[PDB]
Amino acid sequence: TLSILVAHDLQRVIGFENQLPWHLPNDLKHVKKLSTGHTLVMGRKTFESIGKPLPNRRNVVLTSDTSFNVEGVDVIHSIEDIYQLPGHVFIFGGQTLFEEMIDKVDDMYITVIEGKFRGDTFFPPYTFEDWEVASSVEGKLDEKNTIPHTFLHLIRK
Ligand SMILES: NC(=O)c1ccc[n+]([C@@H]2O[C@H](COP(=O)([O-])OP(=O)(O)OC[C@H]3O[C@@H](n4cnc5c(N)ncnc54)[C@H](OP(=O)(O)O)[C@@H]3O)[C@@H](O)[C@H]2O)c1
Ligand SMILES: COc1cc2nc(-c3nccs3)n(-c3ccc4c(N)nc(N)nc4c3)c2cc1OC
């Protein structure tokens, strides 16, 4: 299976200055649970933003940099390389990767951040005419998670 994982706000903002615009621990937990034991494919900028490979999953980084060789990370240099990766593959970001892969993925696990943030990077537009809502679950709010959010699982019709 080839899936997208993304958190985007009401206007599809996904990032600002190479970081998440919001602090939402529950989104990170959501992503951890979905991807543990599986594969993440991310662009070079997203990788450098996180700063280290995430434990207990395969970390694959897409970059044109032939000097890229980081411990605990596998490197690919083409979009086509993604299709040769076994198991459940998750497209992990960022904007460029999402734009390249939205037409290619089986499904999407979206965290809709129910707010309007300042962004410099965006998830591409999509329509529910193309995507079936497999599930929609309202995120629980507490002291550490104060922004309303909804976990959507969308499957291409
Ligand atoms: N909200 C979310 O779910 C989420 C998740 C992840 C990231 N983000 C955000 O997204 C933003 C980053 O997005 P971005 O588009 O600027 O960067 P990005 O997608 O993370 O990485 C872009 C880089 O990936 C490499 N790349 C992409 N396609 C390639 C291809 N076909 N062949 C070879 N290399 C390729 C290139 O690396 P080289 O220049 O090294 O060649 C390119 O510069 C940040 O703000 C981050 O916080 C948000
Ligand atoms: C150390 O723990 C984490 C740190 C993280 N930093 C990030 C950053 N995102 C953008 C810039 S940095 N995340 C990420 C990375 C990708 C995500 C995606 N595709 N989708 C969703 N929903 N959340 C993400 C969180 C992270 C996810 C993490 O745990 C899973």
Curated annotation (Swiss-Prot):
State where substrate binds. 5-6, 27, 49, 57, 92
Known pathway: Cofactor biosynthesis; tetrahydrofolate biosynthesis; 5,6,7,8-tetrahydrofolate from 7,8-dihydrofolate: step 1/1
Source organism superkingdom: Bacteria
What InterPro entries has UniProt attached to this entry? DHFR, DHFR-like_dom_sf, DHFR_CS, DHFR_dom
Catalytic reactions on record = (6S)-5,6,7,8-tetrahydrofolate + NADP(+) = 7,8-dihydrofolate + NADPH + H(+)
Q: Which GO terms describe its molecular function?
A: dihydrofolate reductase activity; NADP binding
Is Cell inner membrane set as a keyword in this record?
no
What keywords does the record list, in alphabetical order? Answer: NADP, One-carbon metabolism, Oxidoreductase
- Indicate the segments forming the DHFR domain, all copies: 1-156
Q: Does the keyword NADP apply?
A: yes
Q: Could you tell me the EC number(s) of this protein?
A: 1.5.1.3
Q: What class of enzyme is it?
A: oxidoreductase
What is this protein's function per UniProt?
Key enzyme in folate metabolism. Catalyzes an essential reaction for de novo glycine and purine synthesis, and for DNA precursor synthesis.
Q: What is this protein called?
A: Dihydrofolate reductase
| Gene expressing this chain | folA
